[PDB]
Design a protein around this ligand. Sequence first.
Ligand SMILES: [Zn+2]
Ligand SMILES: [Zn+2]
Ligand SMILES: [Zn+2]
Ligand SMILES: [Zn+2]
Ligand SMILES: [Zn+2]
Ligand SMILES: [Zn+2]
Lengths: 276, 271, 278, 261, 279, 279
Amino acid sequence: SFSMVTRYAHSPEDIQHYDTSKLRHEFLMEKIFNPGDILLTYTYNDRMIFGGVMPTDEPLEIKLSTELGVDFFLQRRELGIINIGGAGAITIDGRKDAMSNQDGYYIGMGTQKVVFTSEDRDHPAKFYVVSTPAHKTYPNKKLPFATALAKPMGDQQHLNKRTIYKYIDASQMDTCQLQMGYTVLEPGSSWNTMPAHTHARRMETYMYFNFADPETRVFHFLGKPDETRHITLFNEQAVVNPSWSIHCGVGTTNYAFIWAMCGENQTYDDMDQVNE
Amino acid sequence: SFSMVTRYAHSPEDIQHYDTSKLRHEFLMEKIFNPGDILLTYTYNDRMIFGGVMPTDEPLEIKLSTELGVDFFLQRRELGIINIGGAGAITIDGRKDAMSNQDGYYIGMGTQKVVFTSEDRDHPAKFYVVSTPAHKTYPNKKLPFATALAKPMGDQQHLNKRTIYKYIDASQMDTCQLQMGYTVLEPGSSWNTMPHTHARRMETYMYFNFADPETRVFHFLGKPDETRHITLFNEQAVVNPSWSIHCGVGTTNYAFIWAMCGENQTMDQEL
Amino acid sequence: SFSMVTRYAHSPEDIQHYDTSKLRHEFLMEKIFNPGDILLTYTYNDRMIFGGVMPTDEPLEIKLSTELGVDFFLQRRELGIINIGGAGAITIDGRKDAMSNQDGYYIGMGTQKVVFTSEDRDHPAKFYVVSTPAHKTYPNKKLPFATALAKPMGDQQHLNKRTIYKYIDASQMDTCQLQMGYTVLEPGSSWNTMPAHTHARRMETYMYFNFADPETRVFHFLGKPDETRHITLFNEQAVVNPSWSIHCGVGTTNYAFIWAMCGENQTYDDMDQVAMNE
Amino acid sequence: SFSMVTRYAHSPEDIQHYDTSKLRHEFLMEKIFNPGDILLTYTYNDRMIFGGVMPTDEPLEIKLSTELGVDFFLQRRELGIINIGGAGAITIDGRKDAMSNQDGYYIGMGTQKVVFTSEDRDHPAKFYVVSTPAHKTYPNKKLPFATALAKPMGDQQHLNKRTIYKYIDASQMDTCQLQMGYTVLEPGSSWNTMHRRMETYMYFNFADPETRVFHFLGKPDETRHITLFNEQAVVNPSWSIHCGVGTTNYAFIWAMCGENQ
Amino acid sequence: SFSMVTRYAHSPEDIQHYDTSKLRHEFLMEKIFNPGDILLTYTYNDRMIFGGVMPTDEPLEIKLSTELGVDFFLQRRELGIINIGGAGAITIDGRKDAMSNQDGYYIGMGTQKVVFTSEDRDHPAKFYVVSTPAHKTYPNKKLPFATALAKPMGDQQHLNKRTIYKYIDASQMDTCQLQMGYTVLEPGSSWNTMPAHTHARRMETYMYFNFADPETRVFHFLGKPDETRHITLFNEQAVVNPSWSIHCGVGTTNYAFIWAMCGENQTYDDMDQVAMNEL
Amino acid sequence: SFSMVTRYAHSPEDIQHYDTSKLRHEFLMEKIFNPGDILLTYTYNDRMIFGGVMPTDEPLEIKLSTELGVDFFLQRRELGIINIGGAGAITIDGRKDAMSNQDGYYIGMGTQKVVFTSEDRDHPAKFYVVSTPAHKTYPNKKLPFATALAKPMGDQQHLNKRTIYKYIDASQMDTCQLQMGYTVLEPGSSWNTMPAHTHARRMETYMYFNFADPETRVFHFLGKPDETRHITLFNEQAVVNPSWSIHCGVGTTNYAFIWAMCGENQTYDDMDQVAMNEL
Ligand SMILES: [Zn+2]
Ligand SMILES: [Zn+2]
Ligand SMILES: [Zn+2]
Ligand SMILES: [Zn+2]
Ligand SMILES: [Zn+2]
Ligand SMILES: [Zn+2]
């Protein structure tokens, strides 16, 4: 009931002739949150590990030692966490801290044991986890949804009306590379990251969830800015966006997504704004 | 100048590995309205001819005989016309009839002379024209935008809020195969054909009246499981084979004229 | 015992690298007349429907309404029919009309029911049928073999010596689109369409039959005149020739074929002859 | 104006996706007989050398030593010759023997000098030449059109009616590997040949200027065709069928070699 | 005359049908040391930057701020340096340190200015440079060739006879992810890393130089252990080895190479060496 | 239990995009010597037949008549033989002649019956056999390992130190086309045919055997000099090298190989040397 799959990096040239089924296998995590299970992807775009943890009966922990060539999961890595599901808790080295819906956590490198548990097994917590390599330990921090700063953005004419939530951000805190945020599109607005960009020096992974209706789908565009493809996403699915690719998506209704960013810098304005 | 370019039909399998540059060449007409010229595409998806006529100083007529193996353009064909530009007139066999903005016209099989004129050379008429093969002559008809029937459709939740305008429609008139309509998405809505594949008919969409110059429309095609997209600037058109779905999304609101033909005038409802 | 398959149209570039098995699947109908069955093809080259209704005794009907988005098969289409087999019958709106060998029939737009029957189950009828979309009803007409003008053509030096028979022809009849003909090569001549002639404004389907002996084969050439491929045809097989392709064939012996043409014009002089090079 | 081109062999699998121009480049010799010239192709299907020599003003000899890794052309090879044009002669080591139209010749391994001449420069001899590697010297022999045993075959119903002329045939004579013959379809017949061995066909004597021959090659299930003008040649590897059909009648010289005679 | 070219990562599948010119373009840095120039590759295999700095007349420095989206080259990165050419010096923030032949250097995250100079313009220093992303400052260290620690290895029977030189090694020093070493093959031995290893969690870049005679070539094998390709190497050229690929080489004669390693761990035991079945 | 597989010729272009699995299928005979069996490959590069005959319980003969379109195997062909295994014998038309380890034999065109036997069932002879088309009968000849015609070649710096043994050679003997030799690399040298050559008028097949250790591997390079590939070999495997391809190999240890050559000439200097630039 634990799975971690490996995905290789590619050039723009390599994917040019991929069909939709090949694009989907290569860039799309089709199953993230499943009850009782840990589902993870390891991408060779900056060695990000991401997935979800949905504990029910037994408490769930990510135990990786020999698999990463290390003594314990976070020995050389750091970790972001956001709970998009029901009420639950994570205990960090024995200190149990409760996490409600949309509560975040940062866990710095060197932290040896993090255990994921849910309060009500029939409405469990869904922990979206993103781990990146780390050379420096920074203090663990809880990012409450309560104290999270909501910023409305976008207008109705451009169909981008949304609320942006800072979670793991170099302005509020210090991390090695990982950055994470939360974006809720208002009803009647489906476009995300519409003015698009390719930041060569970092990559992003988007995970789309909280779909308005079970019938909504999101079309995520990726690819070189002149050559764009799209992947159609159902609820609680994610797509990896390499450094050379634009990352944007359009919905049939409103939805929400978590983006995770990493690379060799945290500076937000290094991107090249994009004609496609 | 006059231009008519030819485009072949394809299988879904044939297009599966096309890169963006080849899809664009194959399914996308990138220049439709240019001043003084008539620009046309002939697609082997049901032999539709479509394009634009922008007369300014010299009246423009589509002169086709030997190219179509026929004595004059409309001997075996019918013709739709919609004016998306300035005020103008079409003279049908010497009879000049004025066409205001968004005025439509249908011209049945057998009409030997259609010449396009514009009122103001500096605000010319832009005539979007669609011709399909026709075996029966039906009366020519003027379709004023004034008397056209607007139908409100869509909500804000699904971002499809729009007004539907029937122009050449089998309920309002009789044509062999050709059908044409006009759809204006209200501000805050970019989705068109929010539902599909009609295996028994094909469609060509021409997008125009972009709200802002920065607007772009992403039109999806392909069988529903393997979908590709072409990104469109203002005043461009894309052909939808019978086997492909019809979708488009703008970054803002926009308008498009659809033109349909096929084996009937009467559709089955991704990745 | 009724079958209709769909086949998509293509560009020349699309087929340039097709292998031989792909060419056969895309352009070739491998079975037309089968006992008890009706087999049909729908080509996206001008939406021609062609095939055969090869009964045993009483039932055969083409049930197409919703599949074509219409109330009945011929509401928006017309239909040509040739009997290449034994004596049989088609019933038009309840009116049963018997068909001898090589008798033709045309049925205009709007005719609501046609049912195919044969007398002897052991000497059955083979009905070759071609339907194209139609916007105008035209009179049904009988194409008798007795009064069918035989037109001799070709010499032995060019191995094209043959008899040409007009059936559905714009000089003798009125149709929306469809045209059909019948050609019997004399023994010692197998070549058909000696200059190749691509006509951009219409397409053709060739159905080859009446092979001299069971071992004969016909090689049907297609493709742009510079890049030509060929499909090897057994008896009672058909090949779709898109507007952009030459249509040629040579047999190892004599044979016969029905050609069916449709498109946006009926003009026979609108073609580009391909001079003898390839 | 001496030419020899190299062409590699292939598997059936290799050609499956060749376009028309590629098959022609790989399997089709487009110019064989040009006045005054020798034109040759070296194919890696059994290292057959074939082409034509059309002497006009100057006598012509195929001079190959270093390129074939030998001291003279025929040191390790043998040579067949058929003259499809006007009267001529070959002087073999100074001994001149006249070659009329459709005269044959075999020249065994070890013969150092073959010189091709024609009487009239304005209706020259056309020498179609085929050479195969040879391990044993056999006598040089003239193969007259008269004494070349003709075998009639085919009927009009099958449009294959022709007379087959054996020239170099293991029944009348001995060679290392090479076998060569001459086949003329009668008027109103265009079909030809409706193996340890390969074949090279050179089609000529087209009835009318518009005649074309479609030569089929490939495995029996996957067949292609090449379109042939007059005086052109096509190689058929061991794994390929050998077929052709013309728009009129014509002639061809076949040359075969391989692991059996 | 500063160059940094970008090279993308690939799947094993992606390269399977690469022809010889394509393999070279994707995996081979063909020119590293040229007089007066800085030549660099940025590879999306763990974002390693490598190349050479060969100063002659004018002092040379790697100046990157906006291109990497940072304030200075080393703000988020660390830097290894080994001088394979003549005597020269690197001045770190104005503080000049001399660099003799085969002298090494490590420069930790945060040092703002490193300037490479050569003593004699006609026999310049050839500085091989390797930079990896770095989150933690560690002390700069000079690694003199004099005090380097050699380990002889291999026999003549396996043609692997060689001497190994520790330069940037977690035993002598602490770095974020970079590791670097130097290996000189004895005459009569051309094989490097012969029993071949994959380690999924780290990648390697090899730069081969000091070829015994001008005619020698090195054949570097890469690819999955079942599907292996090779690139043919002249003197002073380098090859990038993805985490999924083996690292091998054979010369027609002896030679030397510098290896540079990084990844998400520094543990050398993490690799799983493939038993000898290849292709 | 007789096998002969057929392999077609190719152009350089044809193989340029072959993957590893395809090259092996086209150019590599993976099993040659198996107890009790005849294993053979027919290549359309000059129609060479090669393989192995390992008699144990019953006598073995190569019976090919109608398959090659002849009455008996050698009617149009000649045959080279070298025994790399245990003690054995070939009986030529009833005349039994013994063959020890590394004993050779040439058998000319027209010999109707060649029968292979082994002395000890459990230490069988491994007869490596090579047949080429032949138009002329030449005398059968036994080629004892005793009279070796041995000769050392190469130096230690180039790792080619080796012994060359002439077997079927046009200076000592007369054959139609076939030429065969045996080359033993001394321990501490693995390179064969290192200065590499391509001869349009001849092709070669290498069969590698006597690997020093069970883990030894040989990397055989083939292809046009600019576009080169390689196949990695176990012990007792063979590789076909078309006229347009280089012939090279490197071992992880020493080994031996038997080369067999044919073509339209026997000239040993008709070849093109490859200057060391090969991509
Ligand atoms: Zn981004
Ligand atoms: Zn539609
Ligand atoms: Zn035609
Ligand atoms: Zn043959
Ligand atoms: Zn390594
Ligand atoms: Zn050689």
